[PDB]
């Protein structure tokens, strides 16, 4: 599909090679606040944990539920938001080192949950002995540090190992998956609001206003137009001159729907949620009950 010209060079094939952005942690923080992904993170996390947990321990039914099943949800939200959800457990005595599992801690312990922002992964053993290049061995949650077996890591979709440190040993924020998207949609939307106020501008092409500005004695013509605009309606006809010319100019996003369509289609793809939810027609087929409606994307969950 390449010959007999310079077509070989200017096509989309060779005119651009592939590369992926690495959005910074601070940008990762901002999108967690932003409204759009706020529902993305909330929806996907809830769809994963809302009464979907098969417990093989009927005795003390769902002691998980009343204690930390809510900690996990904030933590698994921190998975999607930052690519690293963290649950930290330790006894009444703060310890850098491992939890004493010689007698496994019988609910004499506290629970913490941490975002990938303040949390992070530090120390991988490059040898194949205990935990491969993936799993860290000890990392800092704050000024403090926490042992590996102390901490539980909610790690999202991980990249290839050759670049795992650039995500600091775990997961990938959905933002990194749709940073192409959220920026684009925001661009679509910020422009969407400002187009209407400039949808049509009345124009007084007025002869001599060349000079009036140039002589800087243009105060009166502005005043008359201001009084004239103060009442320009269906009810009173303009009065202008033969040499004058009133015209109207319209500017508007001719393909606002198309681009907003394309951007939303992809976010439905990458997040896995349907197109209907992004549009907001949640009533149709994307619901809670799993009979047929949650089946709409339950495979992704």
């Amino acid at each position: 599909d390449v010959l007999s010209g310079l077509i070989n060079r200017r096509n989309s094939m060779a005119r651009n090679r592939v590369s992926h952005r690495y959005l910074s942690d601070e940008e990762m923080r901002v999108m967690y606040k932003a409204g759009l992904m706020s529902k993305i993170i909330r929806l996907k996390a809830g769809y994963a944990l809302n009464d979907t947990l098969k417990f093989e321990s009927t005795q003390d039914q769902e002691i998980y539920k009343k204690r930390l099943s809510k900690h996990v949800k904030n933590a698994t939200k921190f998975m999607l938001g930052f690519g690293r959800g963290v649950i930290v457990v330790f006894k009444n005595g703060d310890d850098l080192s491992k939890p004493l599992e010689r007698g496994v801690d019988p609910k004499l312990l506290k629970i913490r949950v941490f975002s990938g922002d303040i949390a992070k992964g530090n120390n991988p053993d490059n040898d194949l002995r205990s935990e491969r290049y993936y799993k860290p061995k000890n990392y800092t949650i704050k000024g403090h540090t926490i042992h590996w077996t102390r901490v539980v890591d909610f790690t999202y979709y991980m990249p290839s190992e050759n670049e795992l440190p650039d995500y600091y040993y775990g997961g990938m924020s959905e933002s990194e998956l749709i940073y192409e998207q959220f920026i684009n949609d925001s661009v679509v939307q910020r422009a969407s609001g400002s187009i209407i106020e400039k949808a049509s501008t009345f124009v007084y092409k007025i002869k001599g206003y060349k000079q009036l500005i140039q002589a800087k004695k243009e105060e009166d013509i502005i005043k008359y137009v201001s009084t004239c605009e103060d009442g320009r309606s269906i009810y009173g006809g303009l009065i202008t001159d033969a040499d004058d010319e009133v015209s109207t100019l319209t500017q508007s996003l001719t393909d606002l729907d198309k681009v907003d369509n394309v951007t939303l289609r992809r976010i439905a793809m990458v997040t896995g949620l349907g197109m209907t939810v992004l549009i907001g027609e949640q009533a149709s087929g994307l619901n809670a009950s799993g009979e047929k409606e949650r089946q709409g994307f339950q495979d992704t969950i």
Binding site: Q214, A215, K216, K217
Partner: protein, 118 residues
């Protein structure tokens, strides 16, 4: 202020009494020919140029009761010129292009141009 005095220096060539008995007239009302301010030093040049225009083409000065607007093609005896046209169809520009002093007035102030109030 010293408009009559600042004027005399900036245009040492007009006349004596003739400019002395007319500037105290156009000083009264230049403020509604050109809405500038006499501070902003080179705006002051604009005022002087306009005042100078209003006095050189005042009939009490050149004895020319007829109007005075720019010439597009003048011919005298055996010498004739045809000035290349510019910004036609505007009496304001034509009126001030009648004299050199006015020509400067368009043009100290030619940079203030622009649209406004949308």
């Amino acid at each position: 202020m010293a408009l009559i005095d600042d004027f005399k220096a900036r245009f040492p060539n007009l006349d004596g009494s003739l400019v002395d008995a007319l500037v105290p007239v156009y000083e009264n009302n230049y403020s509604c020919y050109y809405g500038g301010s006499y501070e902003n030093d080179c705006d002051k040049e604009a005022i002087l140029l306009l005042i100078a225009h209003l006095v050189v083409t005042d009939p009490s000065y050149s004895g020319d009761e007829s109007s005075s607007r720019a010439v597009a093609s003048q011919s005298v005896g055996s010498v004739s010129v045809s000035f290349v046209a510019g910004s036609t169809g505007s009496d304001w520009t034509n009126w001030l292009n009648s004299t050199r002093y006015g020509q400067l007035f368009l043009m100290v102030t030619s940079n203030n141009m622009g649209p406004s109030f949308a």
